């Protein structure tokens, strides 16, 4: 269908996108001084590093599902989820740890917390990736309920992660300070969404597409969809509010 | 390895009957079992992937079922481009292993064979051997048994059998068999008899002739 | 869209080596394994082997090992398989089968027929089948032709090339002991019709360049 | 051949002693008042329940590859190792934050960096069991070569956390405390010799094995050498010098 010239478009401009709000964050670095706020920088550099990474690799999914392509989807698609969600979390902690009227945390502990918290599932990826290349099959004799059930359970620690991150971020919304609770808030709409997303294209690639007779027709479009429109609700509902209230200070 | 048994060798049905292939494996291969269909001098085609998934481009009759060590495949509606050679194939783990192969055709009423019986010509005996050749024109089914008796006796391993494919037009065979000796035990004998029964033949049916009445 | 193209049919001697060439069309042929799988003549589908082309890495039937030979050349795209010691089993047709994902072996070469037999090519002997008293009622005559001592295949034989279809019957060749071919090609025409009608057989075999026209007739001339 | 009820009477023997260590220490947690020594106590009981499964783990050695014990095998011995190391490493952390002047962990944090440390571990032998067995070829179509290198690359992580117990037990050294330090001293020699033998047994199976043109014939039996020879370790040079030491009061 013509889903491989819309997605692809779709994935294109994001990459376009993310460029130049990378561009309008590292100005920004040059003209914020607050010192609260400023320590969250280095971690939303990261965060939409990692947006630009799954914007790239919508097109592995675009490209034909190859004994290539494989690996790169199955180490590179939680990775970046879990960066992305652990960058959120990071500032999810900063804002409840500043709400309640605590030293904020320096932008190194942050970035500690962004990138210590998405070890876990580059080891967990590069293990099962080679496992499979090295002592397995490399994929080959893999039927589509097999390679949908390792995909999906590959994504357990992205999915505590999510929760982590909203009930972290739902933290936020109590304390003597209200200048924080707008960010915390703009997370956990973020997170909220992300949620009902995964939640929507798990349920369709392991029940829903085998019961209308669309396996594995439509296990590489959803998977697509799913992560085009997840990395454009990171961009639009977390990314450029957060680049819109830093440009009014 | 995992022996991969089909079942039945060969079956016989018309146009639109439903038939069934049963596959049989000797150890689980869970549902990591494909189906191809094979036309005699072509390359085998593609049918069935992962036990009950059909390929781009297959017709909805064909329908894969089964899990562990019990597989089928199902033809609804037969048609005259679906008579052919089936096999099961396992690649759960390697190496890969095939069945033998069930072959599809078509199912007719009884017809009895028309007999006819060759001379060796004398230019072949001027070469140097003799060959006497038994032909069976148009029958059903393929199963006709035939004895080659020279002077009332029975002789054996001096005997080849060819058989034609079943026709496009009237679904019927055809049996040619050719008996070898040379010049000399040809010098030997003089009555030359060709032998045959068949189940469409109330019985057995023999043509026979003489040196030197040809 | 995707296409694998093999080699032609070859003959060889029960001592030799044989390769067999696959090139590969339209898709990447980097990251697709390919099987090897041959089929004896009236016998089953038999696997050989794999090779991966993006590391060249091999995996050989049990059976074959110490024999078998796969390569493949990413620049022209072609999987190639060499068989050594041949045998008079391995006569057979060699199918190169690509593997993608989630699949069983969907896309297939022609095929290719590799015959090994001692026996040199040789010129197809044709000799006339006529009844030895015909016209005894019962007008379903039947004439033939007997090719005989011939290599390799194929035959073709047609009656007079342009006039007799209807109900003509050319049997498949059986491999002799002697490791030529022999085949027959019969007719079937009415009892009234042979003695004003002649009778040709034209035999068309290719890598002997014979041709033998030859003339049915009970007896006489 | 004369490895034969020679390591099967040390393993039971070790079993034997450390049920009558496990009794020890119980009477001796509930007969001390003092509240900065006890909250060792706890940790080091499961470090006891580790080293008893480590003996009857011996048993598993004892036996040849098979399948139901090679899993059995590539599970345990990593996660029980990790399990003795983590116990040191808690005990030499609060070792750490004592000695310079400062308070003592709880027990539960004590038990808890403890748990924390081995849960890695036991994620990275689960899922290397389970993709071995489900998602690959299984442990009898492997190779001697390709088993020995798997075995030995599933501890690195465990081989990490000998190092950090190294470390950390060499910082406790500096100090105005002298009542603690014998503590660190014990687990210094314990992690010291742990680190000779773990060496040893690898260079063993890995280099020492194909030189000597005997493989796979000693690769049970140094493994269970080496296991056996380590849990004796942890038992004679920490269990029973603590024991000595928790005794006088
Ligand atoms: C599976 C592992 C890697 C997950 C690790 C999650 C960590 C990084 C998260 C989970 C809960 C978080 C804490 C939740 C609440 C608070 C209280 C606040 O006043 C300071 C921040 C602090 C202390 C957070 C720091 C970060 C934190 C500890
Ligand atoms: C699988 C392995 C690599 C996972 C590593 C993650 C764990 C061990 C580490 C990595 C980064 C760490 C965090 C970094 C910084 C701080 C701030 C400090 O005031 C409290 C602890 C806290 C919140 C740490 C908790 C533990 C932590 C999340
Ligand atoms: C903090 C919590 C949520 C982390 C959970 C970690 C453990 C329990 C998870 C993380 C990755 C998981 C593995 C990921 C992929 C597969 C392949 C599948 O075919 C069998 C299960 C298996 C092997 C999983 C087993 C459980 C596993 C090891
Ligand atoms: C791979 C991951 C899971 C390893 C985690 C190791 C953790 C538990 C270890 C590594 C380094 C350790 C710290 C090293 C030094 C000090 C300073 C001392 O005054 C108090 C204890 C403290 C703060 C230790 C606490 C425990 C510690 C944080
Ligand atoms: C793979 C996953 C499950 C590994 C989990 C290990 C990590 C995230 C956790 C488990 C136990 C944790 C420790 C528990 C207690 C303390 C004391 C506190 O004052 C500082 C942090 C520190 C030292 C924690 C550091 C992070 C820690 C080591
Ligand atoms: C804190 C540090 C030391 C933790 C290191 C974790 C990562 C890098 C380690 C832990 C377990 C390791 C795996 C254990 C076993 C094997 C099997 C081997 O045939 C290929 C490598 C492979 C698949 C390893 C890859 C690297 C790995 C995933």
Same mark, same amino acid.
């Given at each position: 269908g013509p889903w491989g010239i819309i997605l692809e478009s779709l994935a294109i401009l994001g990459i376009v996108v993310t460029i130049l709000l990378l561009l309008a964050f590292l100005f920004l670095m040059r003209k914020i001084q607050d010192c609260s706020q400023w320590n969250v920088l280095p971690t939303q550099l990261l965060f939409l590093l990692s947006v630009l990474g799954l914007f790239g690799l919508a097109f592995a999914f675009i490209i034909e599902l190859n004994q290539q392509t494989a690996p790169v989807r199955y180490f590179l698609f939680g990775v970046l989820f879990a960066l992305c969600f652990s960058c959120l979390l990071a500032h999810a902690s900063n804002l409840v740890k500043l709400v309640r009227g605590c030293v904020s945390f320096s932008w190194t502990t942050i970035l500690c917390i962004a990138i210590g918290c998405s070890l876990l599932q580059i080891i967990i990826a590069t293990e099962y990736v080679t496992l499979i290349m090295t002592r397995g099959m490399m994929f080959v004799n893999m039927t589509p309920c097999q390679l949908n059930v390792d995909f999906v359970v590959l994504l357990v620690y992205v999915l505590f992660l999510m929760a982590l991150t909203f009930f972290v971020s739902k933290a936020? $919304?109590? +304390?003597?300070?209200? !200048?924080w609770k707008q960010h915390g808030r703009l997370i956990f709409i973020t997170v909220l969404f992300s949620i009902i997303i995964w939640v929507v294209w798990i349920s369709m690639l392991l029940r829903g597409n085998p019961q209308f007779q669309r396996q594995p027709q439509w296990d590489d479009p959803v998977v697509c969809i799913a992560l085009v429109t997840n990395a454009w609700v990171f961009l639009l509902l977390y990314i450029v509010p957060e680049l819109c209230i830093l440009y009014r200070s | 390895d995992i022996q991969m048994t089909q079942s039945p060798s060969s079956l016989s049905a018309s146009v639109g009957d439903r038939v069934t292939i049963t596959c049989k494996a000797?150890? !689980? @291969? %869970?549902?990591h079992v494909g189906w191809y269909q094979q036309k005699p001098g072509k390359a085998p085609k593609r049918l069935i992937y992962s036990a009950s998934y059909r390929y781009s481009g297959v017709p909805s009759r064909f329908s894969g079922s089964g899990s562990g060590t019990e597989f089928t495949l199902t033809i609804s509606n037969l048609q005259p481009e679906d008579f052919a050679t089936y096999y099961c194939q396992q690649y759960n783990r390697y190496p890969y292993t095939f069945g033998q192969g069930t072959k599809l055709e078509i199912k007719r009423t009884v017809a009895a064979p028309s007999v006819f019986i060759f001379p060796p010509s004398d230019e072949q005996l001027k070469s140097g051997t003799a060959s006497v050749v038994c032909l069976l024109n148009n029958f059903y089914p393929r199963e006709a048994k035939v004895q080659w008796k020279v002077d009332n006796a029975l002789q054996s391993g001096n005997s080849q059998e060819s058989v034609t494919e079943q026709d496009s037009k009237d679904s019927t065979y055809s049996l040619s068999s050719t008996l070898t000796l040379s010049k000399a035990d040809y010098e030997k004998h003089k009555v030359y008899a060709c032998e045959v029964t068949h189940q469409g033949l109330s019985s057995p049916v023999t043509k026979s002739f003489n040196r030197g009445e040809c | 869209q995707v296409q694998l193209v093999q080699s032609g049919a070859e003959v060889k001697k029960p001592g030799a080596s044989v390769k067999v060439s696959c090139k590969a069309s +339209?898709?990447? $042929?980097?990251?697709y394994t390919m099987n090897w799988v041959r089929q004896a003549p009236g016998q089953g589908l038999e696997w050989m082997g794999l090779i991966n082309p993006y590391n060249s890495d091999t995996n050989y039937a049990q059976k074959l090992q110490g024999r078998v030979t796969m390569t493949t050349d990413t620049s022209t795209s072609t999987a190639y398989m060499e068989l050594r010691? #041949?045998? /008079? &089993? &391995?006569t057979a047709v060699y199918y190169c089968a690509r593997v993608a994902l989630? @699949? %069983? #072996?969907?896309y297939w070469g022609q095929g290719t027929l590799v015959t090994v037999s001692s026996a040199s090519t040789k010129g197809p002997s044709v000799f006339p089948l006529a009844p030895c008293?015909?016209?005894?009622?019962? /007008?379903?005559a039947a004439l033939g032709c007997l090719v005989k001592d011939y290599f390799p295949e194929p035959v073709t034989v047609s009656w007079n090339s342009g006039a007799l279809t209807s109900g003509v019957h050319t049997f498949p060749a059986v491999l002799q002991s002697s490791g030529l071919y022999s085949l027959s090609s019969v007719v079937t025409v009415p009892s009234s019709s042979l003695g004003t009608k002649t009778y040709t057989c034209n035999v068309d075999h290719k890598p002997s360049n014979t041709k033998v026209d030859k003339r049915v007739e009970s007896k006489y001339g």
């Open positions: 936020t $919304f109590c +304390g003597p300070c209200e !200048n | 000797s150890q !689980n @291969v %869970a549902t | +339209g898709y990447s $042929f980097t990251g010691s #041949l045998r /008079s &089993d &391995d989630r @699949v %069983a #072996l969907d008293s015909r016209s005894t009622s019962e /007008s379903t």
